[PDB]
């Protein structure tokens with residue numbers, strides 16, 4: 663509990679494995695996964711974020727999303743309300759129907775976009791919480807490698823003025839993700 667796991671990429675971006683649940687995020691940006699209808703109470707990650715943030719998070723998302731055509735890969739920005747961050751980036755994650763290989767590529771593009779948004783806002787840190795393998799057809803270890811590799815890729819190919827830290831937020835009882843990230847971090851250190 664007392665430590666975060668740490669891995670810095672060759673390009674200088676620090677990744678932290680944080681085992682505190684998703685409600686305690688203390689980064690500038692937190693990324694949420696939302697449905698196409700923008701209802702924040704459906705999936706378990708979003709429901710958890712909503713429970714801490716308060717219903718104002720839903721109020722603001724509904725307002726920013728009104729009359730916006732929303733599809734897979736849409737990213738909408740709100741303030742954080744009672745979360746301990748500055749902004750939430752609400753993303754419509756892909757599902758398996760988008761195609762197997764396609765869906766991994768789409769997740770990579772989403773990860774990259776959210777980091778680019780954070781840098782464009784002159785912010786320092788972004789958190790990606792575990793969303794689960796909800797409606798995606800790959801095991802958690804595939805997604806752990808994917809996100810870490812994308813952080814490596816992004817930071818090697820870009821000079822970053824402000825973005826310094828990427829936090830992976832895991833619930834301490836998420837045994838499968840804790841094992842996947844721990845193995846990846848151990849392997850790369």
Ligand SMILES: CS(=O)(=O)Nc1ccccc1-c1cccc2c1[nH]c1ccccc12
Pocket residue numbers: 693694695753755769772773790791792793794795802805806808809830831832839
């Ligand atoms: C698929 S997962 O959420 O179980 N894997 C992770 C476990 C812990 C922290 C981050 C991720 C993760 C991996 C790949 C893409 C995303 C992840 N979290 C996100 C949250 C929002 C949007 C994309 C992502």
